[PDB]
Amino acid sequence: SGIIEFHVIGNSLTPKANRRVLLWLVGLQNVFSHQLPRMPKEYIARLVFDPKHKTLALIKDGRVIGGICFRMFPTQGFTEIVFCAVTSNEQVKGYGTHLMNHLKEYHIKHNILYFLTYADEYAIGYFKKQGFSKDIKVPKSRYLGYIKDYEGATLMECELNPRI
Ligand SMILES: CCC(=O)SCCNC(=O)CCNC(=O)[C@H](O)C(C)(C)COP(=O)(O)OP(=O)(O)OC[C@H]1O[C@@H](n2cnc3c(N)ncnc32)[C@H](O)[C@@H]1OP(=O)(O)O
């Protein structure tokens, strides 16, 4: 291959069926754990391997270099962004943005035009660059008890424009 690849992966029932995917999920778990050191490792493991969660993985030379773990709520009309990370040495090259753009294109194709996420204070500017806002248009009745809340984090929303 020799080039970056985007793979939407996860655990559909059991992770043993596809070893390549398993290895990538472990890779993701490790990247998320390293780049989100305040999240418990067991918690990251649990969600990455949860059948209702998918992860858009960025793979370079068979190695996970970043990912966005998410959960789609089609009937609610949004997706929850759960974890978002690029490995350290590959940061500040445009990959965090590429990832999010890819994720947006994927969701436009699935007619889900809202992302919700809880952002750490020191990550807010990243989300803002990706078009997220603190102003939430998804009604609280729609996301309360659907999305996971976090301590001291700021709820942010991206309204996707499918046009162009
Ligand atoms: C909501 C769920 C969560 O995970 S909350 C926390 C978000 N994730 C993390 O904090 C994990 C640790 N951080 C990272 O992995 C990376 O810093 C992330 C956020 C993924 C960005 O990856 P990276 O590959 O460097 O992205 P990039 O090259 O496309 O550049 C990012 C562009 O956004 C801008 N930005 C503005 N404010 C911030 C900020 N507070 N942190 C990071 N980036 C920020 C950058 O300046 C950059 O824009 P530009 O290229 O200068 O125009």
Give the ligand 1 atom nearest the CA of 120: 5
Q: Whose CA is nearest to atom 46 of ligand 1?
A: 126
Given resolution (angstroms): 2.0
Question: How many domains does the chain contain in total?
Answer: 1
- What is the chain's Cα-based Rg? 15
Q: How far apart are CA 81 and CA 48, in angstroms?
A: 12
Buried b (16+ CB within 10 A) or exposed e, 39-77: beeeebbebbbeeebbbbbbbbeeebbbbbbbbbbeebe
Query: Residue positions in the annotated binding site for succinyl-CoA?
Result: 84-86, 91-97, 122
Residue 64: CATH number of its domain: 3.40.630.30
The catalytic residue among 5, 42, 80, 151 is 80
Dihedral, CA atoms, 95, 132, 149, 94, nearest 10 degrees?
Answer: 10
Q: How far apart are CA 14 and CA 30, in angstroms?
A: 19
State which residues form the domain around 61: 1-164
Task: Mark residue 32 as left, alpha or beta (left: phi above 0; alpha: psi -120 to 50; beta: remaining).
Answer: alpha
Determination approach: X-ray
Q: Taking a C-beta distance cutoff of 8 angstroms, is the pair 96, 66 a contact? A: yes
